[PDB]
Structure 1
Amino acid sequence: TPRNIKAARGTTLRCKGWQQETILRLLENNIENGERPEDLVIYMNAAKAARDWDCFDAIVRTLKTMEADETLVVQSGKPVGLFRTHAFAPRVLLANGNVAGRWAGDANMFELEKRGLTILPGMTAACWQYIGSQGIVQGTYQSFVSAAEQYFGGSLAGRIILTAGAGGMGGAQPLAGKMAGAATLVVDVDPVSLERRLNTGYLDVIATSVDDALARIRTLAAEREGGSVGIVGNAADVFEALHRKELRPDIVTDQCMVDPYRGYVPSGLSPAEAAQLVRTDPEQALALAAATLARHARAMLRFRDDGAVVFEYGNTLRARSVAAGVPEAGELPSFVTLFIRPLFCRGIGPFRWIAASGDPKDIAAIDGIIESTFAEGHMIRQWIPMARKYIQFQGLPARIGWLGHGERSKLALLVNEAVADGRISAPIAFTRDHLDAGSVASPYRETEKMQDGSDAVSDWPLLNAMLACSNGASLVALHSNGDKSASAGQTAIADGTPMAAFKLKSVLDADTGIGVIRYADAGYEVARETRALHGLGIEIGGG
């Protein structure tokens, strides 16, 4: 018998107070929007909201009975203690997925998870900050727009984007590409993944074959219209076929789950046969997945040699391809270094907010505060109309709205006032992905090729989490992805009170502040000037 978790709607408390209730609803919202919610899996195949259902039930009970001056402590998805702290402390502290680095290799991480000692935490899966496919779509859209500005004269009309991966997060690629004007073709081996994008508005059409997809993409390109087409098939086989048939894409990227232990499908298997092979014969699953990934990466490089702009989109494809024997895949650029890093230098990152009421009018109210607040032509003034027009709510109504240093606390204080005075019906939860300037160390991705070589320095997310606790964030998390990266998340709730006014301002300005500091420290001049302008620095002699 299925759980079918849904977040509570409306304005009735089941907990002792709105801070606790909002976090409960965020946890419930994660599972409501998850890719495999009956396994607690939220996205990327195995990133979970809780270690297991008994752990989930205990977390829920504790949120319903904890006081506003108590702090629940969660360890890799498992509630482990409830401490009396104080009103200005967080209500929940989480550390998920962290393993000392020498033993945090891929094989040992898989063993530890299989024995119940750890979970794959993702970024927003295990600390309850997921808002469905919307959470990533602004960054995927921004990446395509910036590609268009840098390499295609500022327009994707008539241009073709080819990608793979229509999962919980990759599912935003087809919509991102359509919004940016491109004829967008997404490959996924699982027809269920395409149907789920088709039903949530993220995909327009599912093709019946490669030939059919080719025809529909050429039509969109010839009309110079944005639209998206899905193909069912393995990226390795389909990318090869698309080259034989002369697709000639302008952009090629990929957002499959390429982890051979967790959801990469070898050529000729289904998702279920692959999961079963990992269970019964992992050495053969690994060999088969590497052979498919090698072809997959070679197909992208073949497009790159014909003239396509090929980049990695944050799924570790390059490093895993190099390990599977494609050394040239290590030479591919990344969306971060081509498009996102100059935004991080200004503290601009995937800020986001969730209506705890479940009422879409609460989001439309905040979209309205944004249009009265931010200058015309600002990034956010261009984005909110796109979101309004193209993005269907999933679970609790929520909005991705990238904003930068000082802008996040400005918006959150105006929302907190709007909660206090009745324009918004219930608290708003502010959070963000961990793909942000001051909250992640990740040499394969966010911090690849730092100007000063500090790629792997992970002091920075630890400081980000310690500041969030010290500033009164409602919920703070520290996550790792094996031995490859470390990140910090935090949630801060606008409940209309003055206490929340103080917290929203302290937390969010320090959250973007430490990111600006981090990039100024690396030597990025735009960050150094932002740091100086906002008084974020410390004067050190002998410079």
Structure 2
Amino acid sequence: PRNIKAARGTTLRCKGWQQETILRLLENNIENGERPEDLVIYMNAAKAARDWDCFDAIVRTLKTMEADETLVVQSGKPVGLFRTHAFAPRVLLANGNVAGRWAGDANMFELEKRGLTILPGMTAACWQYIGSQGIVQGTYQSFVSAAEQYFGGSLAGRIILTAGAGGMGGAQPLAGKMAGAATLVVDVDPVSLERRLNTGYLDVIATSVDDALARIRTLAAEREGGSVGIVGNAADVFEALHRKELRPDIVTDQCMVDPYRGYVPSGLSPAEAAQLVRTDPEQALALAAATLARHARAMLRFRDDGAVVFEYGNTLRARSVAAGVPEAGELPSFVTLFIRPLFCRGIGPFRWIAASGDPKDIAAIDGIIESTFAEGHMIRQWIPMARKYIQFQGLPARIGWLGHGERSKLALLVNEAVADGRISAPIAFTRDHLDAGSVASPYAETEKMQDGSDAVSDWPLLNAMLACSNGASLVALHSNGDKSASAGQTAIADGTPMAAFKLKSVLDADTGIGVIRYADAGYEVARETRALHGLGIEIGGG
């Protein structure tokens, strides 16, 4: 038992607070991981570092590096330390990037097996994970937008069905509950439900399908929001819930559907599945695809009854198409129905973390927001909700979606609050990679762009390079094999005037490049936002 835990308090182990914050962020990733003794954070096998040896050497370099040197990380392995300057980043990471033609599913698996790459996830290998809370606002925003679009602004009395209680999926049953819906989440692995049940993200774990149906219908009939977990395989349980007439209003899914990493064929356990992939991969893929076709056909069968059925960024439709269900490619997605209007204004999963470990530092910022943004603002209705439902996990932190100009504004107020004692230690500002100007993903975030530019990955590359040029504390470029590319970045509010400058340079360009990206594709709200903030360039013949 390594049992990594982020350091608490205000005593440096590093030569300076930039380094110590990143070290604590690294430790905090592991502390909140789904399988932390394997470095696994989430998405079945996305890791904080390539192995425990690289983890140890990363920790040593953080502790002794100077404020004008920069650590270089190649797929979870520290490979260099360069003398740079004080306004440059302290860490540069590039994880899981493989040239497209050889980044197919099968070869990524082989390269990872041989130790040549890691699967970075989004926030796993760049140390920006804050547990299940980093996901919950986005998923709650989706359920609320769905209630606004299709159910008259209310999920009271409505049924939400979904699967996946993993590191990201586990945020589902709380978001549904916060949204007013009776929410049923299927997971094949009881430990996953047990982890959400104990963390405050699941209300009860049902003992059977019948039991699950009675408890959801009671919530539905009382028109109360609540969460009900079921232990079972989504293929088998989805079909039984249709035979028993659950009649769900909303069906979605956040399973790991990767046959190589996490999708459990019907009849197997998670353990058996992972062993069949190590010893007989071709049978596993045959069994996985067999189970996914039933899984997808069951979701399509709920749609035929009138449920709103969408994908939630896990490649279910495409992988389902590959397994013989071409109708699965005609299902919609959470992005095109709910999130893209937010991205057009640069609104994304902005988050922050108290290196202190003191919950009073988060509550402090919570008061800043309520004194700083107008009532009715998206963020003024989220903070009371987060305060109410969301337990801290590891270093106290907060998810707070904000748009262009608003991120730099809050970050400067927090940097001043640090500078004058209301906050006891530095605040790390970061985000998910799935932000307006930092990801190209044709299966998810950039599906069906107005101008057809789905697969253009120039944008995240520019996002990273801007973050470096602006002085972010840590900058990362990831890939999901041949399907997606994205940029992440961390900027530290430590109280210094140097921090204040970086925070406003970094954050305004972070969202500014997102506004530009969507304006370029033709979205009119983004084009107006770009015109208003001077974000454009005059090009003739237009």
TM-score by length of 1: 1.00
Count of matched residue pairs: 542
1:121 alignment partner, SS class: coil
Deviation per CA, 1:239-273: give whole Å up to 9, x if none.
00000000000000000000000010000100000
1:361 alignment partner, SS class: helix
Give the Cα–Cα distance (whole angstroms) in 2 for the partners of residues 176 and 354 of structure 1. Answer: 21
Give the Cα–Cα distance (whole angstroms) in 2 for the partners of residues 213 and 406 of structure 1. Answer: 45
Deviation at 1:228?
Answer: 0.3
Deviation per CA, 1:272-305: give whole Å up to 9, x if none.
0000000000000000000000000000000000
Aligned residue number for residue 165 of structure 2 = 166
Deviation per CA, 1:128-158: give whole Å up to 9, x if none.
0000000010000000000000000000000
What fraction of aligned residue pairs are identical, expressed as a percent? 100
Deviation at 1:528?
Answer: 0.2
Give the Cα–Cα distance (whole angstroms) in 2 for the partners of residues 49 and 101 of structure 1. Answer: 23
Deviation at 1:400?
Answer: 0.2
Give the Cα–Cα distance (whole angstroms) in 2 for the partners of residues 462 and 62 of structure 1. Answer: 26
* 1:353 equivalent in alignment to 2:348: no
Deviation per CA, 1:45-86: give whole Å up to 9, x if none.
100000000000000000000000000000000000000000
2:169 alignment partner, SS class: coil
Give the Cα–Cα distance (whole angstroms) in 2 for the partners of residues 415 and 318 of structure 1. Answer: 42
1:9 alignment partner, SS class: coil
Deviation at 1:122?
Answer: 0.3
Deviation per CA, 1:494-533: give whole Å up to 9, x if none.
0000000000000000000000000000000000000000
Aligned residue number for residue 235 of structure 1 = 234
Deviation at 1:363?
Answer: 0.2
Give the Cα–Cα distance (whole angstroms) in 1 for the partners of residues 540 and 32 of structure 2. Answer: 51
Give the Cα–Cα distance (whole angstroms) in 1 for the partners of residues 498 and 315 of structure 2. Answer: 41
* 1:377 equivalent in alignment to 2:357: no
Give the Cα–Cα distance (whole angstroms) in 2 for the partners of residues 467 and 179 of structure 1. Answer: 37
> Which consecutive unaligned segments of at least 5 residues does structure 2 have?
none
Give the Cα–Cα distance (whole angstroms) in 2 for the partners of residues 302 and 293 of structure 1. Answer: 14
Deviation at 1:313?
Answer: 0.7
2:57 alignment partner, SS class: helix
1:286 alignment partner, SS class: helix
Deviation at 1:206?
Answer: 0.3
Give the Cα–Cα distance (whole angstroms) in 1 for the partners of residues 441 and 253 of structure 2. Answer: 19
Deviation per CA, 1:352-392: give whole Å up to 9, x if none.
00000000000000000000000000000000000000000
Give the Cα–Cα distance (whole angstroms) in 1 for the partners of residues 505 and 26 of structure 2. Answer: 24
* 1:445 equivalent in alignment to 2:444: yes
Give the Cα–Cα distance (whole angstroms) in 2 for the partners of residues 41 and 214 of structure 1. Answer: 34
Deviation at 1:212?
Answer: 0.3
Deviation at 1:181?
Answer: 0.1
Deviation at 1:235?
Answer: 0.1
Deviation at 1:22?
Answer: 0.1
Give the Cα–Cα distance (whole angstroms) in 1 for the partners of residues 517 and 34 of structure 2. Answer: 34
1:352 alignment partner, SS class: strand
Give the Cα–Cα distance (whole angstroms) in 1 for the partners of residues 409 and 317 of structure 2. Answer: 38
Give the Cα–Cα distance (whole angstroms) in 2 for the partners of residues 376 and 355 of structure 1. Answer: 25
Deviation at 1:474?
Answer: 0.1
Give the Cα–Cα distance (whole angstroms) in 2 for the partners of residues 63 and 445 of structure 1. Answer: 35
Report matched runs for 1:242-261 at 5 Å. Answer: 242-261=241-260
Deviation per CA, 1:332-353: give whole Å up to 9, x if none.
0000000000000000000000
Deviation at 1:10?
Answer: 0.2
Give the Cα–Cα distance (whole angstroms) in 1 for the partners of residues 162 and 124 of structure 2. Answer: 24
* 1:473 equivalent in alignment to 2:472: yes
Give the Cα–Cα distance (whole angstroms) in 2 for the partners of residues 80 and 153 of structure 1. Answer: 55
RMSD: 0.2
Deviation at 1:168?
Answer: 0.5
TM-score by length of 2: 1.00
1:73 alignment partner, SS class: strand
Runs (4+) of structure 1 moved beyond 3 Å?
A: none
Give the Cα–Cα distance (whole angstroms) in 2 for the partners of residues 183 and 326 of structure 1. Answer: 29
Deviation at 1:194?
Answer: 0.2
> Which consecutive unaligned segments of at least 5 residues does structure 1 have?
none
